[PDB]
Design a protein around this motif. Structure first.
Motif, mmCIF file in Angstrom:
data_model
loop_
_atom_site.group_PDB
_atom_site.id
_atom_site.type_symbol
_atom_site.label_atom_id
_atom_site.label_comp_id
_atom_site.label_asym_id
_atom_site.label_seq_id
_atom_site.Cartn_x
_atom_site.Cartn_y
_atom_site.Cartn_z
ATOM 1 N N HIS A 125 1.088 -1.449 -0.213
ATOM 2 C CA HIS A 125 -0.117 0.064 0.244
ATOM 3 C C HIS A 125 0.489 1.278 -0.224
ATOM 4 O O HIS A 125 0.517 2.212 0.499
ATOM 5 C CB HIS A 125 -1.021 -0.294 1.142
ATOM 6 C CG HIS A 125 -1.960 0.992 1.571
ATOM 7 N ND1 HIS A 125 -2.144 2.177 0.315
ATOM 8 C CD2 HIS A 125 -2.486 1.912 2.800
ATOM 9 C CE1 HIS A 125 -3.705 2.933 1.345
ATOM 10 N NE2 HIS A 125 -2.937 2.657 2.149
ATOM 11 N N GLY A 126 2.299 1.043 -1.174
ATOM 12 C CA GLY A 126 2.618 2.177 -1.494
ATOM 13 C C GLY A 126 3.985 2.728 -0.463
ATOM 14 O O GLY A 126 3.993 1.069 0.542
ATOM 15 N N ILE A 127 4.207 3.632 -0.370
ATOM 16 C CA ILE A 127 5.732 3.800 0.656
ATOM 17 C C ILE A 127 5.250 4.822 1.519
ATOM 18 O O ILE A 127 4.702 5.927 1.689
ATOM 19 C CB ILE A 127 7.064 3.537 -0.612
ATOM 20 C CG1 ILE A 127 7.058 4.982 -1.233
ATOM 21 C CG2 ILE A 127 7.311 2.848 -0.678
ATOM 22 C CD1 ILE A 127 8.333 5.897 -1.902
ATOM 23 N N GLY A 128 6.408 4.783 2.565
ATOM 24 C CA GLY A 128 6.847 5.999 3.352
ATOM 25 C C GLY A 128 7.283 7.735 2.505
ATOM 26 O O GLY A 128 7.484 7.802 2.165
ATOM 27 N N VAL A 129 6.595 9.038 3.243
ATOM 28 C CA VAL A 129 6.019 10.117 2.216
ATOM 29 C C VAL A 129 8.113 9.970 2.716
ATOM 30 O O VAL A 129 8.867 10.490 2.207
ATOM 31 C CB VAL A 129 5.854 11.151 2.498
ATOM 32 C CG1 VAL A 129 6.210 12.639 2.294
ATOM 33 C CG2 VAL A 129 4.354 10.572 2.272
ATOM 34 N N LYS A 130 8.394 10.334 4.176
ATOM 35 C CA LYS A 130 9.508 10.673 4.764
ATOM 36 C C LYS A 130 10.620 9.501 4.624
ATOM 37 O O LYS A 130 11.572 9.437 4.391
ATOM 38 C CB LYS A 130 8.915 10.741 6.213
ATOM 39 C CG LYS A 130 10.483 11.724 6.881
ATOM 40 C CD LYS A 130 10.577 12.359 8.267
ATOM 41 C CE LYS A 130 11.833 13.068 8.757
ATOM 42 N NZ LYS A 130 12.714 12.511 8.879
ATOM 43 N N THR A 131 10.122 8.411 5.088
ATOM 44 C CA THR A 131 10.919 7.098 5.120
ATOM 45 C C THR A 131 11.106 5.963 3.950
ATOM 46 O O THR A 131 12.537 5.636 4.210
ATOM 47 C CB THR A 131 10.157 6.121 6.626
ATOM 48 O OG1 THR A 131 9.495 5.448 5.884
ATOM 49 C CG2 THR A 131 10.305 6.971 8.501
#
Ligand SMILES: Nc1nc2c(ncn2[C@@H]2O[C@H](COP(=O)(O)O)[C@@H](O)[C@H]2O)c(=O)[nH]1
Ligand SMILES: Nc1nc2c(ncn2[C@@H]2O[C@H](COP(=O)(O)O)[C@@H](O)[C@H]2O)c(=O)[nH]1
Ligand SMILES: [Zn+2]
Ligand SMILES: [Zn+2]
Ligand SMILES: [Zn+2]
Ligand SMILES: [Zn+2]
Lengths: 363, 363
Positions: free
Chosen positions: B207-213
């Motif tokens: 379900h996608g990826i972290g914006v910061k991480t």
């Protein structure tokens, strides 16, 4: 006389999950698109409802009747209207045909783009759920109006660590365009609003203790002062009486500041909780007020102003009333109890109303 | 033939904040008060609405029209009713006069007391806001029905650390009566439901990826299998196609499991997102499906079943459609796009419907 327009998006204390705490503020009469939010429960969805729903007005209740006469919930002198104000709507009606041809969803996005500063009282989920879920709307346009979330440290630190953390929510604050920002306020300090010619003055208050940690849980009261008129409103986060000997008297500090710095005639309203009625089951009351505790606090303010007229003329707008599986709408019970106790305490011509979602107050 | 009743409490993908993802499940026809929830967006508030609102049915839209004919959103063969099912309501009507005399709020508390297990797909706030805000209802009675929140570790760990932590929410899991519990499920393992004679089988998805991480963000698909009939439904959390070479093919693993273990005739429905239309602006699509990606996944399932009949008879119930400032309701756009692409891909007599809040499906 009227200086502030307050749109009540949410005044529900829970446990039902919609219409939780959020108030929109703007100067009276003027037609700029810019808006301030205090708290961040009910948001876009509620703005949309208000656009659509826009006399013998009935409001939702769900107790003795599913709908009840509006007048039952308010002081007879309260300047209140259903829906968004003419001046708020005028910002959309600047373009004749465009307004007409914009569907309800589009109008919702347009109004909401103007909500660019939030003042969050505390990070309990009911006070931030709309702020959070609505936040991706900021990316609909390249020439976007940027939003800022303000709060005391107990609020901002929690939002950074526990919400905008790529786990509970994508960390939109880490996006390089910085269209969503978190900013801290210092307690007790007169700070400036970004667009309106207003001062904002935040004060820390108590809101119970951690279940596991036993740690004091903090909240915030916000004073908004119009610099021209000197008129003020107070918009409160969830709060309880300060705990006798274990805690600092944060409420006494607050009332003292108000009485010293804001003449009663300039205090145009206080939006403050009364989550529970007098019958108060302990579990629902923790961290909150009931009518005796709210009246005790208002009595303290009264003592500080020190007038034989009491709090005559003060508008008290009661927020955050909780549902309960009771026979009668607790908002009605609470309103009656507050009025009775205010009279018993000789608080004068105090004007008490329940905050009603989907309405604008003019104070 | 019908084995499952699915109450759609919320199917909104955001960014408006109400009616977000939550589905209630129970066996068809039977009248026990017990209910399962998948996800925890829309909750008590929506149950109350459904009680009150209970033909030429119109449903909310807010695009070309504020309300639209229900039939526009669904396959003509879909077994759907407005409101709560007769069998769900019968649990309240066990007491003749009591039911009649209980106000809408009281009925809401009573129905909701039966929602005792949640299966959470992922801890994004839109999937847990109702679960969280509704949770204090568990303390209304001493002889309380206890609630359990189930999930894979990526979900449960986040709820413990970031939600029930005395900061975002009082840590109700730390209350000694343990009326609210968090419990982990093992991925890919057939586990048992607590009351219904059903298996629950959870699978991890992307379900996608972290914006910061930049870290992969995980979600869950749940299979519910009625042991007697062998009939199954699949209820999905937010999901994207697996990222080519950087990620494990979690979706392929899932479809392979379904095709190997569940004959198509026993697969009574899949509730799966299509957040965005084909016009897909990149920002809104991140971590989600659009019609080409959803059809590609269904094509993979089709290939695995390996029938000349394609996916004939399969009910695909599309969830989590996002608002957009578009001229036309994106649910209608998406439904048309999915149907067109399904035909183009020769998927057979696939029956595609949009999930509609305030309705019950019988599958
Ligand atoms: N049973 C129980 N409930 C609590 C406790 N602390 C907080 N709560 C609940 O947590 C909820 C938090 O949202 P708030 O009430 O602050 O708007 C409250 O409704 C309150 O009932 C507690 O110590 N025990
Ligand atoms: N602009 C932007 N938005 C994101 C990013 N990642 C997630 N989001 C937003 O975060 C929201 C999370 O809720 P969900 O979409 O999973 O239901 C989504 O609507 C999505 O638009 C990102 O990397 N950039
Ligand atoms: Zn609250
Ligand atoms: Zn609170
Ligand atoms: Zn979601
Ligand atoms: Zn999500």
């Amino acid at each position: 006389m009227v200086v502030f327009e307050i749109t009540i998006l949410g005044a529900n204390g829970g446990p039902t999950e919609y219409g939780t705490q959020c108030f929109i503020l703007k100067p009276a009469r003027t037609e700029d698109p810019e808006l301030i939010a205090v708290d961040g429960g009910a948001g876009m969805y509620q703005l949309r409802e208000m656009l659509v729903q826009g006399d013998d007005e009935l409001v939702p209740s769900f107790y003795e009747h599913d709908r009840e006469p509006i007048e039952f919930f308010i002081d007879s002198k309260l300047n209140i209207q259903k829906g968004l104000s003419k001046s708020l709507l005028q910002s959309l009606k600047r373009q004749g045909e465009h307004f007409e041809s914009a569907n309800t969803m589009k109008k919702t996005y347009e109004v909401f783009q103007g909500i660019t500063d939030y003042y969050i009282t505390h990070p309990h989920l009911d006070h931030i759920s709309g702020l959070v879920v609505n936040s991706p709307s900021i990316y609909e346009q390249e020439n976007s109006k940027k939003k800022t979330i303000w709060g005391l440290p107990h609020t901002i630190d929690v939002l950074q660590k526990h919400v905008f953390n790529d786990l509970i929510w994508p960390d939109l604050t880490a996006e390089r365009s910085r269209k969503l920002k978190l900013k801290c306020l210092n307690p007790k300090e007169v700070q400036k609003c970004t667009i309106f010619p207003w001062d904002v003055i935040p004060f820390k208050v108590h809101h119970g203790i951690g279940v596991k940690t036993g740690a004091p849980v903090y909240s915030t009261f916000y004073i908004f002062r119009d610099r021209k008129s000197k008129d003020c409103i107070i918009v409160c986060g969830d709060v309880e009486q300060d705990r006798r000997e274990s805690e600092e008297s944060l409420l006494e500090e607050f009332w003292s500041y108000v009485a010293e710095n804001i003449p009663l005639v300039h205090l145009k309203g206080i939006l403050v909780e009364c989550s529970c009625p007098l019958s108060s089951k302990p579990e629902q009351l923790y961290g909150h007020l009931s009518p005796i505790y709210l009246i005790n606090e208002l009595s303290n303010l009264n003592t500080l102003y020190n007038s034989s007229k009491g709090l005559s003329g003060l508008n008290v707008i009661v927020t955050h009333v909780k549902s309960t599986p009771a026979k009668r709408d607790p908002r009605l019970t609470i309103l009656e109890e507050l009025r009775f106790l205010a009279e018993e305490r000789n608080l004068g011509d105090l004007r008490i109303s329940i905050a009603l979602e989907g309405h604008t107050l003019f104070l």
